[PDB]
Scaffold this motif. Structure first.
Motif, PDB file in Angstrom:
ATOM      1  N   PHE A   4       2.303   0.053  -4.282  1.00  0.00           N
ATOM      2  CA  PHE A   4       1.656  -0.648  -5.376  1.00  0.00           C
ATOM      3  C   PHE A   4       0.883   0.367  -6.202  1.00  0.00           C
ATOM      4  CE2 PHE A   4      -2.728  -0.970  -3.616  1.00  0.00           C
ATOM      5  CZ  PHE A   4      -2.467  -0.497  -2.357  1.00  0.00           C
ATOM      6  N   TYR A   5       0.890   0.175  -7.512  1.00  0.00           N
ATOM      7  CA  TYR A   5       0.275   1.105  -8.442  1.00  0.00           C
ATOM      8  C   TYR A   5      -1.216   0.834  -8.570  1.00  0.00           C
ATOM      9  CZ  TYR A   5       0.320  -2.786 -11.709  1.00  0.00           C
ATOM     10  OH  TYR A   5       0.122  -3.997 -12.320  1.00  0.00           O
ATOM     11  N   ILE A   6      -1.948   1.841  -9.044  1.00  0.00           N
ATOM     12  CA  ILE A   6      -3.358   1.655  -9.373  1.00  0.00           C
ATOM     13  C   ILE A   6      -3.714   2.116 -10.773  1.00  0.00           C
ATOM     14  CG2 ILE A   6      -3.916   1.918  -6.934  1.00  0.00           C
ATOM     15  CD1 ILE A   6      -4.983   4.610  -7.443  1.00  0.00           C
ATOM     16  N   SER A   7      -2.914   2.952 -11.424  1.00  0.00           N
ATOM     17  CA  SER A   7      -3.180   3.331 -12.808  1.00  0.00           C
ATOM     18  C   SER A   7      -1.914   3.932 -13.386  1.00  0.00           C
ATOM     19  CB  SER A   7      -4.332   4.318 -12.901  1.00  0.00           C
ATOM     20  OG  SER A   7      -5.567   3.633 -13.007  1.00  0.00           O
ATOM     21  N   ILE A   8      -1.465   3.393 -14.515  1.00  0.00           N
ATOM     22  CA  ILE A   8      -0.223   3.808 -15.149  1.00  0.00           C
ATOM     23  C   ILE A   8      -0.526   4.172 -16.591  1.00  0.00           C
ATOM     24  CG2 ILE A   8       1.858   2.888 -16.172  1.00  0.00           C
ATOM     25  CD1 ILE A   8       2.768   1.946 -13.628  1.00  0.00           C
ATOM     26  N   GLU A   9      -0.208   5.407 -16.969  1.00  0.00           N
ATOM     27  CA  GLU A   9      -0.435   5.903 -18.315  1.00  0.00           C
ATOM     28  C   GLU A   9       0.809   6.630 -18.798  1.00  0.00           C
ATOM     29  OE1 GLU A   9      -3.180   4.460 -18.788  1.00  0.00           O
ATOM     30  OE2 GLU A   9      -4.942   5.562 -18.089  1.00  0.00           O
ATOM     31  N   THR A  10       0.809   6.981 -20.078  1.00  0.00           N
ATOM     32  CA  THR A  10       1.942   7.636 -20.710  1.00  0.00           C
ATOM     33  C   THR A  10       1.511   8.995 -21.233  1.00  0.00           C
ATOM     34  OG1 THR A  10       3.310   5.740 -21.310  1.00  0.00           O
ATOM     35  CG2 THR A  10       3.318   7.631 -22.798  1.00  0.00           C
ATOM     36  N   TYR A  19       0.029   5.795  -7.262  1.00  0.00           N
ATOM     37  CA  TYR A  19       0.509   4.762  -6.359  1.00  0.00           C
ATOM     38  C   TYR A  19       0.087   5.079  -4.935  1.00  0.00           C
ATOM     39  CZ  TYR A  19       4.276   8.062  -5.199  1.00  0.00           C
ATOM     40  OH  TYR A  19       4.997   9.161  -4.802  1.00  0.00           O
ATOM     41  N   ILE A  20      -0.026   4.033  -4.128  1.00  0.00           N
ATOM     42  CA  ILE A  20      -0.410   4.154  -2.727  1.00  0.00           C
ATOM     43  C   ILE A  20       0.852   4.158  -1.877  1.00  0.00           C
ATOM     44  CG2 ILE A  20      -1.888   3.267  -0.915  1.00  0.00           C
ATOM     45  CD1 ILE A  20      -3.127   4.174  -3.730  1.00  0.00           C
ATOM     46  N   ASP A  21       0.946   5.118  -0.962  1.00  0.00           N
ATOM     47  CA  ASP A  21       2.163   5.322  -0.188  1.00  0.00           C
ATOM     48  C   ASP A  21       2.250   4.297   0.939  1.00  0.00           C
ATOM     49  OD1 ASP A  21       0.274   6.189   1.611  1.00  0.00           O
ATOM     50  OD2 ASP A  21       1.292   8.070   2.091  1.00  0.00           O
ATOM     51  N   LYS A  25      -2.011   6.239   1.568  1.00  0.00           N
ATOM     52  CA  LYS A  25      -2.477   7.439   0.894  1.00  0.00           C
ATOM     53  C   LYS A  25      -2.103   7.367  -0.579  1.00  0.00           C
ATOM     54  CE  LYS A  25      -0.766  11.604   1.286  1.00  0.00           C
ATOM     55  NZ  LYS A  25      -1.035  12.310   0.002  1.00  0.00           N
ATOM     56  N   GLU A  26      -2.960   7.933  -1.419  1.00  0.00           N
ATOM     57  CA  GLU A  26      -2.809   7.870  -2.865  1.00  0.00           C
ATOM     58  C   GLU A  26      -2.110   9.124  -3.371  1.00  0.00           C
ATOM     59  OE1 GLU A  26      -6.620   8.167  -4.646  1.00  0.00           O
ATOM     60  OE2 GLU A  26      -5.853   9.544  -6.175  1.00  0.00           O
ATOM     61  N   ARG A  27      -1.136   8.943  -4.262  1.00  0.00           N
ATOM     62  CA  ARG A  27      -0.396  10.056  -4.837  1.00  0.00           C
ATOM     63  C   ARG A  27      -0.114   9.770  -6.304  1.00  0.00           C
ATOM     64  NH1 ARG A  27       3.546  10.495  -0.894  1.00  0.00           N
ATOM     65  NH2 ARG A  27       4.359   8.587  -1.864  1.00  0.00           N
ATOM     66  N   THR A  28       0.264  10.820  -7.026  1.00  0.00           N
ATOM     67  CA  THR A  28       0.577  10.743  -8.445  1.00  0.00           C
ATOM     68  C   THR A  28       2.017  11.176  -8.665  1.00  0.00           C
ATOM     69  OG1 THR A  28      -1.715  11.398  -8.869  1.00  0.00           O
ATOM     70  CG2 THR A  28      -0.214  11.343 -10.747  1.00  0.00           C
ATOM     71  N   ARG A  29       2.726  10.464  -9.537  1.00  0.00           N
ATOM     72  CA  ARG A  29       4.089  10.846  -9.875  1.00  0.00           C
ATOM     73  C   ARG A  29       4.309  10.692 -11.371  1.00  0.00           C
ATOM     74  NH1 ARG A  29       7.543   5.922  -6.998  1.00  0.00           N
ATOM     75  NH2 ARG A  29       6.371   4.228  -7.996  1.00  0.00           N
TER      76      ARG A  29
END
Lengths: 898, 69
Positions: A4-10, A19-21, A25-29
């Motif tokens: 599930f995502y927590i912050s989505i930007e462009t 997103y939380i794995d 754990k929190e990661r950025t893609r």
């Protein structure tokens, strides 16, 4: 677990998503998206839009390519189909199905900053030195308090948690030990070190939500401005993962709010997260007042001006912040907003920050609903604003109405849209219009027998369900289901605690706990076959399920309530002038139709004709006098208030449904609508107390009245709670003591009767002079301290308050007192003619008593008579005049006339 | 737009017109007003009622275009 995502930007052509794995754990893609627009195709295709016209998909290699394609295709004069804002599109494709989330992993920070300075610290100028930061974090549940030991204003000492725990009697700050235990304090000698450490802390644990009271007022606007002015613009950008931070002023509103938009962290101002989702109108929305109203905790009284509290008692200052931050968290626990922002964001498949604006939320929900059904949304056509008719407020004849029955219909606008199918693609055409008076009483001929309609003179299909109707129905059904699940959990927990009180001694074992569903008797016995500890654990699980169900229910309520605020907006893509007016004036027709029907029924049952009982309604509510029916019945039959309320309620049941049900049914067939949905319930009633000559309930003008409420929405009251609205009892102009006095007078007017008002008047006059002048002082805000006056003297037309402001300012020339600052607690007192100051009123900030040089002069030159006349005599007189009650003895001979 | 999506300052002149003049001449520029064509113009419309500059309803009759060169 599921992602599930927590912050989505462009950024550029890429979408950066945090997103939380599966391990929590929190990661950025970063994903290079492939937008899928939709354009009209002549050949047959599966993607049929809402209108019915065929459509075909066009995919692009880059987001900017689709961005150029939209304008390139539009300039030839054709309509594009799909989304224009690709964030919702990305979230929709990435997840698609229902999204499962655990609130725990979402780091919800919290921060309140205290700065000290000579004048009010200006969030935008940012001149003073930030000396208390007090950052809070949810994941670590720890209050990282940063303190500036040495400051330009003054170098203070350290901070003792043990002393803070000690009470004021000992000399401490009585801060709950639990908060102190969860406080990681750190001091700093200079400013750059502390601010860089705050940057580092904000970097180590980048919050997903950043709430707090007035965060977009004196917190974010200041933290960001200061680091920009002391550490340069480059380090300020470290506050965001994308590294992109922006500021836009909003001069549109009087307040110049340099609101910021840190990317990656969803800045959600708790003040504006509360004014929207609370539906509770506190007289003032400051943090201390709302905390006391909600948490019932009372702030510790403090001494002197705030700006000095650091140098006198810095040990009080830092603890004052540690409790100040946590007050917000406690309000949260009571209300659970951050468990509602998350819930609405994930149910709508959108970014967090969009929760604020209903158009975005409804846009997201509508897109996903049609998407699955293989449809494509239109594009936002440009329109212009119009002042379409507002709410129709009935006529208040400000005469005492004795008891009234106040009722309104629940969920007006969604019901209207459900029953008229008002949708962009269900509009057929325009049928010939008649004056509103014609349809309002049925004198006009039937508009048609083919399609449903509105007083707007349009046409709307019946056999084709729209988009808005189906979607509102889906949200209604989800609300009902979640509420039923909530009550099911309620009886589940009640049965569990009853089993606990019966006793249960066995081994410890937790079985599969099915949620949001009532347990069977066998399962209840099996749960009774465990320990008390297992019973309490299951009670805690039921509490968590109850919190989730309540958040879902309030989410649905919020969604539905803010619908008509979108379909009536020019930027909601499904906007039409015809629809936006049809909803409103169909509501108007409905309310006036039920007004006429209730008048007819009351006249028939009471025999008399041409009698008006509806009073002062709005486009939702009608308040029927319902007095003559009881007179026909005979009040002698009743012996207690509760019996009167009982006959009240039984007659309400006998009257509302059998009359109003058919009184909307004939309107429905008259309007050839889809189905009848509009229904009303007796929300409130105001019986005057039995055996007393109190008037019961009166009105003054539109949306101003008083009501001796005895039963609000089937919630009986042992003693009545008066329902005031509009009068001076609430406005800040009247002092608090006079506000309470006005409320007491209102209760005496409604309940006791004539003599009580005059005796209270005499008592209040007796105690009005002897009391302290501050509690009767009309304290107001100093707005234009120099705009009107020419030079000290009030040159041009001067507001009542400004004249006193300048009077006091010119009185203390060289007296050694700080002159007025705009917005201060300046209280305006009129002065008797001939005061040495040289005016009629004086205004100085509250808390500074009159100097002995002028104290006796003002005391002898005070004019309480004028103060009393405007503060209480005028307001009470008008209410009494509109109540048919004389608040002063008139010295008549009627006792001697007979 | 690329560097304004990662928040890095885009140093350097962003008005190409100014940049072009600087690179095209560089040194102090010597001119001559004689060879620049200024135009002085005044008009008087055949308007019974004075019209709006953009709302034209009366016929133009005045031609004036004084020249410098």
């Amino acid at each position: 677990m599921k992602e599930f995502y927590i912050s989505i930007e462009t950024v550029g052509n890429n979408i950066v998503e945090r997103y939380i794995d599966e391990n929590g754990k929190e990661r950025t893609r970063e994903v290079e998206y492939l937008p899928t627009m939709f354009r009209h195709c002549k050949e047959e295709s599966k993607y049929k839009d809402i209108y019915g016209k065929n459509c075909a998909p066009q995919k692009f290699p880059s987001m900017k390519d689709a961005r150029d394609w939209m304008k390139r295709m539009e300039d030839i004069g054709l309509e594009a189909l799909g989304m224009n804002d690709f964030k919702l599109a990305y979230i929709s494709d990435t997840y698609g199905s229902e999204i499962v989330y655990d609130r725990k992993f979402v780091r919800v920070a919290n921060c309140d900053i205290e700065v000290t300075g000579d004048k009010f610290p200006d969030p935008m100028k940012a001149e003073y030195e930030i000396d208390a930061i007090t950052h809070y974090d949810s994941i670590d549940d720890r209050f990282y308090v940063f303190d500036l030991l040495n400051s330009m204003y003054g170098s203070v000492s350290k901070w003792d948690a043990k002393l803070a725990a000690k009470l004021d009697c000992e000399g401490g700050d009585e801060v709950p030990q639990e908060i102190l235990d969860r406080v990681i304090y750190m001091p700093f000698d200079n400013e750059r070190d502390m601010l860089m450490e705050y940057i580092n802390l904000w970097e180590q644990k980048r919050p997903a939500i950043f709430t707090g009271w007035n965060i977009e007022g004196f917190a974010v606007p200041y933290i960001m401005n200061r680091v920009k002015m002391i550490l340069g613009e480059r380090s300020m950008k470290r506050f965001s993962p994308i590294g992109r931070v922006k500021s836009k002023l909003i001069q549109n509103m009087y307040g110049s709010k340099e609101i910021y938009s840190i990317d990656g962290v969803s800045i959600l101002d708790y003040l504006d997260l509360y004014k929207k989702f609370a539906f509770t109108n506190l007289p003032s929305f400051s943090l201390e007042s709302v905390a006391q109203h909600e948490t019932k905790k009372g702030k510790l009284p403090y001494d002197g001006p705030i700006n000095k509290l650091r140098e006198t008692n810095h040990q009080r200052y830092i603890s004052y912040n540690i409790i100040d931050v946590e007050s917000v968290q406690a309000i949260d626990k009571i209300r659970g907003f951050i468990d509602l922002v998350l819930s609405m964001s994930y149910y709508a498949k959108m970014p967090f920050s969009g929760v604020m604006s209903p158009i975005k939320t409804w846009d997201a929900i509508i897109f996903n609903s049609l998407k699955g059904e293989h449809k494509v949304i239109p594009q936002q056509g440009s329109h212009v604003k119009q002042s379409f008719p507002g709410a129709f407020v009935f006529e208040p004849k400000p005469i005492a109405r004795r008891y009234i029955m106040s009722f309104d219909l629940t969920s007006l606008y969604p019901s209207i849209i459900r029953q008229v199918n008002i949708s962009p693609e269900t509009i057929r055409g325009q049928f010939k219009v008649h004056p509103i008076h014609e349809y309002i009483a049925g004198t006009a001929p039937k508009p048609s027998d083919e399609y449903s309609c509105s007083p707007n003179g349009w046409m709307y299909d019946k056999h084709q369900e729209g988009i808005i109707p189906k979607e509102i129905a889906k949200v209604f059904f989800q609300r009902k289901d979640w509420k039923k699940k909530m009550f099911a959990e309620e009886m589940n927990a009640e049965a569990i605690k009853k089993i606990i009180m019966k006793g249960a001694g066995s081994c410890s074992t937790k079985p599969e706990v099915e949620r949001y569903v009532k347990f069977s008797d066998d399962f209840l016995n099996e749960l009774s076959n465990y320990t008390e500890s297992v019973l309490n654990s299951l009670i805690e699980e039921c509490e968590k399920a109850a919190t989730l169900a309540n958040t879902n229910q309030l989410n649905r309520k919020i969604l539905i309530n803010s619908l008509y605020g979108a379909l009536g907006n020019i930027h909601f893509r499904y906007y039409d002038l015809r629809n936006a007016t049809a909803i409103t004036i169909f509501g108007q027709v409905g309310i006036q139709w039920i007004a006429r029907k209730i008048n007819e029924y009351l006249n028939k049952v009471c025999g008399t004709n041409d009698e008006d009982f509806i009073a002062a309604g709005d486009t939702d509510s009608v308040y029927v006098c319902v007095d003559k029916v009881i007179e026909k019945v005979g009040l002698d039959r009743f012996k207690e208030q509760n019996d009167l309320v009982e006959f009240m309620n039984q007659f309400g049941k006998k009257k509302m449904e059998p009359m109003i049900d058919v009184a909307y049914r004939e309107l429905c067939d008259y309007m050839n609508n889809r189905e009848h949905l509009m229904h009303m319930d007796r929300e409130a009633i105001s019986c005057p107390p039995l055996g007393s000559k109190g008037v019961g309930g009166f009105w003054k003008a539109k949306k101003r009245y008083a009501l001796n409420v005895y039963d609000m929405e089937d919630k009986r009251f042992a003693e009545p709670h008066l329902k005031i609205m509009g009068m001076e009892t609430q406005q800040s102009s009247t002092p608090k003591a006079v506000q309470e006095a006005l409320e007491e007078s209102i209760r005496r007017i409604l309940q006791e009767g004539e003599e009580s008002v005059q005796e209270y008047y005499k008592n209040f006059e007796k105690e009005y002079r002897q009391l302290d002048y501050k509690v009767i002082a009309e304290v107001k805000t100093a707005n234009d301290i120099a705009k009107y006056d020419d030079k000290g003297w009030p040159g041009f037309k001067c507001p009542f308050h400004i004249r006193g402001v300048l009077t006091y300012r010119r009185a203390v020339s060289g007296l050694g007192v700080a002159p007025i600052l705009d917005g201060n607690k300046v209280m305006v007192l009129p002065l008797r003619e001939g005061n040495p100051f040289g005016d009629k009123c004086i205004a100085w900030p509250s808390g500074t008593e009159l100097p002995k040089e002028i104290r006796s002069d003002v005391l002898s030159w005070i004019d309480h008579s004028t103060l009393f006349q405007k503060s209480f005599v005028k307001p009470l007189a008008g209410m009494c005049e509109s109540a048919g009650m004389d608040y002063e003895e008139k010295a008549s001979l009627d006792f001697l006339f007979g």
